[PDB]
Design a protein around this ligand. Sequence first.
Ligand SMILES: [K+]
Ligand SMILES: [K+]
Ligand SMILES: [K+]
Ligand SMILES: [K+]
Ligand SMILES: [K+]
Ligand SMILES: [K+]
Ligand SMILES: [K+]
Ligand SMILES: [K+]
Ligand SMILES: [K+]
Ligand SMILES: [K+]
Ligand SMILES: [K+]
Ligand SMILES: [K+]
Ligand SMILES: [K+]
Ligand SMILES: [K+]
Ligand SMILES: [K+]
Ligand SMILES: [K+]
Ligand SMILES: [K+]
Ligand SMILES: [K+]
Ligand SMILES: [K+]
Ligand SMILES: [K+]
Ligand SMILES: [K+]
Ligand SMILES: [K+]
Ligand SMILES: [K+]
Ligand SMILES: [K+]
Ligand SMILES: [K+]
Ligand SMILES: [K+]
Ligand SMILES: [K+]
Ligand SMILES: [K+]
Ligand SMILES: [K+]
Ligand SMILES: [K+]
Ligand SMILES: [Mg+2]
Ligand SMILES: [Mg+2]
Ligand SMILES: [Mg+2]
Ligand SMILES: [Mg+2]
Ligand SMILES: [Mg+2]
Ligand SMILES: [Mg+2]
Ligand SMILES: [Mg+2]
Ligand SMILES: [Mg+2]
Ligand SMILES: [Mg+2]
Ligand SMILES: [Mg+2]
Ligand SMILES: [Mg+2]
Ligand SMILES: [Mg+2]
Ligand SMILES: [Mg+2]
Ligand SMILES: [Mg+2]
Ligand SMILES: [Mg+2]
Ligand SMILES: [Mg+2]
Ligand SMILES: [Mg+2]
Ligand SMILES: [Mg+2]
Ligand SMILES: [Mg+2]
Ligand SMILES: [Mg+2]
Ligand SMILES: [Mg+2]
Ligand SMILES: [Mg+2]
Ligand SMILES: [Mg+2]
Ligand SMILES: [Mg+2]
Ligand SMILES: [Mg+2]
Ligand SMILES: [Mg+2]
Ligand SMILES: [Mg+2]
Ligand SMILES: [Mg+2]
Ligand SMILES: [Mg+2]
Ligand SMILES: [Mg+2]
Ligand SMILES: [Mg+2]
Ligand SMILES: [Mg+2]
Ligand SMILES: [Mg+2]
Ligand SMILES: [Mg+2]
Ligand SMILES: [Mg+2]
Ligand SMILES: [Mg+2]
Ligand SMILES: [Mg+2]
Ligand SMILES: [Mg+2]
Ligand SMILES: [Mg+2]
Ligand SMILES: [Mg+2]
Ligand SMILES: [Mg+2]
Ligand SMILES: [Mg+2]
Ligand SMILES: [Zn+2]
Lengths: 206, 122, 125, 114, 53
Amino acid sequence: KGILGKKVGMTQIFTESGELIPVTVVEATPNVVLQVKTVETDGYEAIQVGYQDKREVLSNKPAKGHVAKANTAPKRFIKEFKNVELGEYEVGKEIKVDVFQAGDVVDVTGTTKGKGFQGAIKRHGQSRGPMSHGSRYHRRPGSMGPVAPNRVFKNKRLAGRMGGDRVTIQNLEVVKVDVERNVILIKGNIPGAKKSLITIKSAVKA
Amino acid sequence: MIQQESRLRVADNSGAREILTIKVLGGSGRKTANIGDVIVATVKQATPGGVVKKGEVVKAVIVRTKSGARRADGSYIKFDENAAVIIRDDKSPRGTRIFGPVARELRENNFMKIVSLAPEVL
Amino acid sequence: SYRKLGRTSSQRKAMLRDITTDLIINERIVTTEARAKEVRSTVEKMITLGKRGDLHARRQAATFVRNEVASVREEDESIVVESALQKLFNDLGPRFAERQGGYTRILKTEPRRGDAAPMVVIEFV
Amino acid sequence: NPLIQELTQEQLRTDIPAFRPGDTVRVHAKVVEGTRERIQLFEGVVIKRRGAGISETYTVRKVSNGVGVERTFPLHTPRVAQIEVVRYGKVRRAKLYYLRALHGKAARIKEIRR
Amino acid sequence: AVPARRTSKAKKAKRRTHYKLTIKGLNACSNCGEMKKSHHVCPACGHYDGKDV
RNA sequence: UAGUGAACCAGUACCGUGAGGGAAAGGUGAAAAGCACCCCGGAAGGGGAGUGAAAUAGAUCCUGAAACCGUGUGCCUACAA
RNA sequence: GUAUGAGUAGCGAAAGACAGGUGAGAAUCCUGUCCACCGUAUGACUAAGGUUUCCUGGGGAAGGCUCGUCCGCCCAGGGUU
RNA sequence: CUCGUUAAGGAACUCGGCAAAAUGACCCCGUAACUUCGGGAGAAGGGGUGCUGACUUCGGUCAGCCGCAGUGAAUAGGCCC
RNA sequence: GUAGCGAAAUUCCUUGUCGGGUAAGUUCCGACCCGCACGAAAGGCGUAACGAUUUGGGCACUGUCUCAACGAGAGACUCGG
RNA sequence: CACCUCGAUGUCGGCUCGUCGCAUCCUGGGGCUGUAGUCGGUCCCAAGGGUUGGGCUGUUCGCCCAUUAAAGCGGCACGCGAGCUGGGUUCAGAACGUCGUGAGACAGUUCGGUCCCUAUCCGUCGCGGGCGUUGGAAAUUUGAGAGGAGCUGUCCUUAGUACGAGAGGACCGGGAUGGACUUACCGCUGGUGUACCAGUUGUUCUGCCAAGGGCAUUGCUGGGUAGCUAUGUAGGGAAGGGAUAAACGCUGAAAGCAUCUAAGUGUGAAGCCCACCUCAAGAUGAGAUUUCCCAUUUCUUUAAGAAAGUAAGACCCCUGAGAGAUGAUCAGGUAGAUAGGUUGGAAGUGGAAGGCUAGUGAUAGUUGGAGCGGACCAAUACUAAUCGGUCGAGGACUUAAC
Ligand SMILES: [K+]
Ligand SMILES: [K+]
Ligand SMILES: [K+]
Ligand SMILES: [K+]
Ligand SMILES: [K+]
Ligand SMILES: [K+]
Ligand SMILES: [K+]
Ligand SMILES: [K+]
Ligand SMILES: [K+]
Ligand SMILES: [K+]
Ligand SMILES: [K+]
Ligand SMILES: [K+]
Ligand SMILES: [K+]
Ligand SMILES: [K+]
Ligand SMILES: [K+]
Ligand SMILES: [K+]
Ligand SMILES: [K+]
Ligand SMILES: [K+]
Ligand SMILES: [K+]
Ligand SMILES: [K+]
Ligand SMILES: [K+]
Ligand SMILES: [K+]
Ligand SMILES: [K+]
Ligand SMILES: [K+]
Ligand SMILES: [K+]
Ligand SMILES: [K+]
Ligand SMILES: [K+]
Ligand SMILES: [K+]
Ligand SMILES: [K+]
Ligand SMILES: [K+]
Ligand SMILES: [Mg+2]
Ligand SMILES: [Mg+2]
Ligand SMILES: [Mg+2]
Ligand SMILES: [Mg+2]
Ligand SMILES: [Mg+2]
Ligand SMILES: [Mg+2]
Ligand SMILES: [Mg+2]
Ligand SMILES: [Mg+2]
Ligand SMILES: [Mg+2]
Ligand SMILES: [Mg+2]
Ligand SMILES: [Mg+2]
Ligand SMILES: [Mg+2]
Ligand SMILES: [Mg+2]
Ligand SMILES: [Mg+2]
Ligand SMILES: [Mg+2]
Ligand SMILES: [Mg+2]
Ligand SMILES: [Mg+2]
Ligand SMILES: [Mg+2]
Ligand SMILES: [Mg+2]
Ligand SMILES: [Mg+2]
Ligand SMILES: [Mg+2]
Ligand SMILES: [Mg+2]
Ligand SMILES: [Mg+2]
Ligand SMILES: [Mg+2]
Ligand SMILES: [Mg+2]
Ligand SMILES: [Mg+2]
Ligand SMILES: [Mg+2]
Ligand SMILES: [Mg+2]
Ligand SMILES: [Mg+2]
Ligand SMILES: [Mg+2]
Ligand SMILES: [Mg+2]
Ligand SMILES: [Mg+2]
Ligand SMILES: [Mg+2]
Ligand SMILES: [Mg+2]
Ligand SMILES: [Mg+2]
Ligand SMILES: [Mg+2]
Ligand SMILES: [Mg+2]
Ligand SMILES: [Mg+2]
Ligand SMILES: [Mg+2]
Ligand SMILES: [Mg+2]
Ligand SMILES: [Mg+2]
Ligand SMILES: [Mg+2]
Ligand SMILES: [Zn+2]
């Protein structure tokens, strides 16, 4: 079980018993199965899924041809889902939020917000140097290594572009499903900026 | 958030007035203690006639903090000061009376004697 | 967001007031790309005040528009001087009574010789 | 944002009285000490209102047994059976953080009878 | 820190591989036919989008 | 780069409070005949047109090396230590 | 003499903006307007020292840490009773 | 690098409270050990400061008003053993 | 080798021993005296006041720190010189 | 010992950053026990992870305080000063004890005392351009290989059971909740928030009143949106396979017996291979799938020839942000909501100006939850993304099968 949606934002919800929990609102306009991959044709089993109808002028003839089989408008996002029952899916089939029910445990994948070039202190949570007592070492990445190798070992973490990575949060709870609004309320917070792509899947650990 | 060297008022009549934190029990690297946590402290100022006396290493439980606690229902409680109660090893308070309001978190932590003696539990 | 224009906060405010009053007076000026892309919003907000026309808008604008001589005529054998603020509320507001925003346009032109700084013309429509 | 408003519009409560920071309110806060549930009254002056929609919260301050205490409640929590406006105070700002430093008479707020 | 070895001609030229100018956005002006920068007022005739300015 | 420090406006320029220290720098052509005039350019500088045996002898002017810089390309080079 | 580093470091405390003018050419020169800075001074006099840097009219080679139509620079006159 | 702000804690930092923070003007009250009797001493520790009326002996006092805050900004000792 | 002082700016053994201060004090303070190796004008002992002196403790204070976060400006970065 | 370095290889301690070894401090498995149980002792396997906060001292060390499951031992120029500090030690000053006749000196102490360098190459962390991957393109992908992560307490129950005479008190099994660490995010609690709101001092300017602007650290002060954020919130190290280490076997001879082994066969660890997360076809071995374009023109020569228009498509240019040092990425370019403005809201502030009323007045009430309102939300082509240009295939051969 899986679906693709757009990270609408964050709010909070009162459960029964009056508890208050943070939820992330993820909207998922019905995704469409654009292609079915099998061991015969591709060597592995999975279904290609498209989401977020795209303006035609924003699409290419090759892209339109690919989606023609499913007989739907061009989709902005396309992703393959594995570990699903291919028998249950066919090109042109629709997937709605109702695939999930409240109380489900899911893995949510997103692309972390990009911070750009960041120093080691922020990027790797390393310790500053003393800010006084004559210190001229505040936000620097520490020693690069011992003398003997005459080089620097790999993974000596340094400043660089931070964020924008594929991150999965495991075992988030599906608080609610609104089919009329194609909304899934997921307990907690999930990676990615608002309007970014989000991938909900049934938790693998479960 | 009470940490080592943090000073707290004493919310009982055990004799001590102001204590200083030595440890935050509960873990090897634990840094901070909040309401309902036990600490090892030293008496930096004691009432002249009290049982507990100045310079004594004692255990205490934090009963109210400036940075208070978050309740499961989404509410919060914050106090105007950091106060603790000196206790024996079995959570029994060393003194007989408790001063000022106390946070309700102590109930689930099983400081029932302090909770009963408290003039008010919030 | 907004641009810093390589000035401190107070300096940027003063420069924007200067350029905005200059555009009000002349209706067409030449500046750099960034200065123009910020002056457009400021001057159009000033025109919004002028369109409103009430005393409250007048004073709000006066906090921003500079105290300069927009124009001078000899009317009734007497010199009539119109300030930048008076021109705004007497001419520019009524002129744009109908437009729903977008009172200015920016035309890109040659880069400046001394800097190669991209230059543009900002002018009322 | 419109979508979030719609989702949380259902749970928004409706009987919240009209009060602003500086007004004295009594909060009928439900409490459970096990199986038994009880209403504990927290009466004090509203120090702060922040947030919007479902996320709006307000803080109430009272000096009990010589110690200042503040409770922050979600404005729409079902755990608060009722909010009652005991008095309307005259203040000049939204956040009354200055009260935390004052005591007794210094912290008094004139009433206005709106 | 100072260069340990002088840079050779070949290495220097390799480095300057990417140190070049470029000219982009030039196409014929509609009004006068002179080459101009797209989205810019034609410096020759002072026309943009078919109007004098 | 020799020969006086100085072949040339040299004990000069320059340095130093001062005593004192102390340079660099020769060559158009036989003859200025030192490029009238025209063209591009604000000029500089060029291209013609001329002088000349020679102008790639045009005054930074005989010859004009090497380092260094550049243009054109016959061959080679983007799995290589 | 010429490289390398390298078209890299630096371009030496701070507010400028626009309109007009001049001009081959202007962020950098002129005029105007507003704005801003110093004001026991970043103002007004002077001694020393400098030694024409003063004024007027020209110039844009070099100097000005960019530019320059401008200058305490260059050219020509003139100025100390 | 220069500068502003900071939850809770408050020297746990460190060789060392280095740096920063804090104190800072005026008026009033009050001020220790010790002493060479001068000092210590601005010890320490506290209080007042805005605006409007009325009255003043003209320094005040009384009453009222406003703010989170009244030497409302800038410039002004941290203290003790 | 007297008085006076003494683990001292002098005590190696030494973090001497004991007491005070701290939860914990090789530093500090008081005391003791087996003074390695004090001692009376290369002065002995004490001493109010003074000290950008050295040393230990306390209050206040805080980004010194737990443990870092944000914002402003200059450089860095892109472009023209 | 004196082999490199005296035309310089910077010395203790600390900080920052770690990495490796195992002779293992904790956690894991196991044998023996003078192992009843709870604790242990010793030995074997085991380096996956973890292994602290202070007082004193320049210190390492060490003692002490308080914790912890534990507070491991070592190498890396006693790692790490072109990464930091500079307290100690080795300069010049001065002083004490001591030695010297003396200048001075230490067989010793004490106070004070300049730590320079713009990264060329490799290396390391990030990001682009070129070409390749054999027709040209748009997407989606397998995973050779690589990295990450790997910790642990307490309580409850089983059970006051097994064991023990009693005190005491379990293995195994099942739950709950923490510590430290860590991946994300701003709905909450807070921080910040220099083009948001308000109060307020001095002076000065808009001629004056009123209302405002300038400067005073953003003048100061009280709040605070977006964004960025931790101490805030959510989540993770779950379960489980495969082959093994020590160890224990089953069957079994050599060796009628015995025997875990030689053949045969099994159990067995936080360890190894998976499992979980991320990168990944420049994996030149350049993979796979879906879809799109279509075999053009001219000249040379049978040329895998040359160039020249294009097709599919991409880019230039332009409007930008959820992206960003710049490239890049992504959202758009009138086939339009990409940004600015405008309109209406929201947060936020806290009652605008101008009036009126009361008051001698400061001021208060009212008009009116007003006015203002950066980044947030929704609509609206009003302004600007105009017009345009550039690049971009015609698909080699050999041999199986058909
Ligand atoms: K010649
Ligand atoms: K060549
Ligand atoms: K050079
Ligand atoms: K060079
Ligand atoms: K001139
Ligand atoms: K120390
Ligand atoms: K004193
Ligand atoms: K007051
Ligand atoms: K003072
Ligand atoms: K002694
Ligand atoms: K001695
Ligand atoms: K002691
Ligand atoms: K002294
Ligand atoms: K001194
Ligand atoms: K700070
Ligand atoms: K700390
Ligand atoms: K040496
Ligand atoms: K054992
Ligand atoms: K290990
Ligand atoms: K220490
Ligand atoms: K190590
Ligand atoms: K160093
Ligand atoms: K080195
Ligand atoms: K090298
Ligand atoms: K003013
Ligand atoms: K001014
Ligand atoms: K704030
Ligand atoms: K490929
Ligand atoms: K009003
Ligand atoms: K409002
Ligand atoms: Mg740290
Ligand atoms: Mg090597
Ligand atoms: Mg200012
Ligand atoms: Mg102007
Ligand atoms: Mg609100
Ligand atoms: Mg000579
Ligand atoms: Mg020749
Ligand atoms: Mg020659
Ligand atoms: Mg290879
Ligand atoms: Mg090759
Ligand atoms: Mg360089
Ligand atoms: Mg300068
Ligand atoms: Mg002065
Ligand atoms: Mg002159
Ligand atoms: Mg002149
Ligand atoms: Mg120049
Ligand atoms: Mg703080
Ligand atoms: Mg605070
Ligand atoms: Mg310490
Ligand atoms: Mg320490
Ligand atoms: Mg200091
Ligand atoms: Mg002041
Ligand atoms: Mg001693
Ligand atoms: Mg201490
Ligand atoms: Mg002792
Ligand atoms: Mg002596
Ligand atoms: Mg003598
Ligand atoms: Mg003496
Ligand atoms: Mg440049
Ligand atoms: Mg030998
Ligand atoms: Mg050498
Ligand atoms: Mg071993
Ligand atoms: Mg070393
Ligand atoms: Mg080094
Ligand atoms: Mg002697
Ligand atoms: Mg010696
Ligand atoms: Mg000194
Ligand atoms: Mg937040
Ligand atoms: Mg928010
Ligand atoms: Mg006035
Ligand atoms: Mg001034
Ligand atoms: Mg939009
Ligand atoms: Zn044209």
